[PDB]
Amino acid sequence: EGRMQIDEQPGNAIGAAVEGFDHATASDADIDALKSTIYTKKIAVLKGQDLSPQQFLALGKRLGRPEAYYEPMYQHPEVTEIFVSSNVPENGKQIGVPKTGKFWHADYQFMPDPFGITLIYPQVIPEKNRGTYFIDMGRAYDRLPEDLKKEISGTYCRHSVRKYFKIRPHDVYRPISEIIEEVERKTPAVVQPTTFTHPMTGETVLYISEGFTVGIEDQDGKPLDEELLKRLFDATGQLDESFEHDNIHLQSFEQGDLLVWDNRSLIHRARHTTTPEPTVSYRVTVHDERKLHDGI
Ligand SMILES: C[C@H](CC(=O)O)NCC(=O)O
Ligand SMILES: [Cl-]
Ligand SMILES: [Fe+2]
């Protein structure tokens, strides 16, 4: 230990690069500084990581408690805790699930107890169309018009996987209404405060995403017209299919990079499939020392 170096982007710019990180030997202070960087700079890019799937899980265990994805078709064949996004067949077989995350979302936002930290370890990186898009929803909250902050004050949002639940191999020949009903039973919509206070930073986070947030309700639980959600999606940059909105950050990476990011503050989205270049990434998702927000 005592060799890790963190290079934060200047000022309010998102992100930091982390050199000399070895998960097997990092000190307690090293991990504390890395976690502080994640919560403050939102994306930490670990450089020069050459890890097996088993070692990648070991690295995640240094940061928190891993949770495996609740649908197992996403899981790595050797490591249940690794979620695999892949469109490269292996021995002709589909590993993980292709073309995941083509919509704005925070990970597990449709679940009652979402984890605070997402780790992505790219395996196959497009030459041209690489990277992941991000919006910092605490910064996006701050940039809302004052009256729009007022309009969501005291409201609650409903989040559900019902739009982007992916058909599974064993769903073939089932009637679609059966699958729709099963999703509502297995993963019922969850209600969260529209905004919450980040336990680590104190920031107010606007916890919505176009992909999972399906309704908004007033302070008494009465459903509000979803045009409010559309206006919030619009203001925060989530309806811009050009990805030019000022809130949007394109995070690129190179071989050996490993992204660790704040899954309270950030929403993210895969790029458009503007090229046929494949993507393969391994994901570990960990709970840290606090719940997503104090109301959980
Ligand atoms: C529905 C998504 C997975 C996918 O894009 O197929 N869930 C990812 C997550 O919430 O962690
Ligand atoms: Cl794109
Ligand atoms: Fe995701």
Numbering used by the authors: 28 to 323
What wording appears in the published article?
With the discovery of ScoE, a mononuclear Fe(II) α-ketoglutarate-dependent dioxygenase from Streptomyces coeruleorubidus, a second route was identified. The stoichiometry of this enzymatic reaction is measured, and multiple high-resolution (1.45–1.96 Å resolution) crystal structures of Fe(II)-bound ScoE are presented, providing insight into the binding of substrate, (R)-3-((carboxylmethyl)amino)butanoic acid (CABA), cosubstrate α-ketoglutarate, and an Fe(IV)=O mimic oxovanadium.
To probe the structural basis of isonitrile formation by an Fe(II)/αKG-dioxygenase, a structure of ScoE from S. coeruleorubidus was solved to 1.70 Å resolution with CABA bound. In the ScoE active site, clear electron density was observed for a bound CABA in the same location that was proposed to be the CABA binding site from the choline-bound ScoE structure and shown to be the CABA binding site in the recent ScoE structure. As expected, Fe(II) is bound at the conserved 2-His-1-Asp facial triad motif. A conserved arginine (Arg310 in ScoE; Arg270 in TauD) coordinates the carboxylate moiety of CABA in ScoE and the sulfonate moiety of taurine in TauD. A comparison of the choline-bound and CABA-bound ScoE structures reveals a conformational change of Lys193 that positions the primary amine of the side chain to interact with CABA. In all crystal structures lacking tartrate both reported here and previously, Arg157 and His299 are both flipped away from the ScoE active site and do not interact with one another. These outward facing positions are observed even when CABA is present, indicating that this conformational change is not induced by CABA binding.
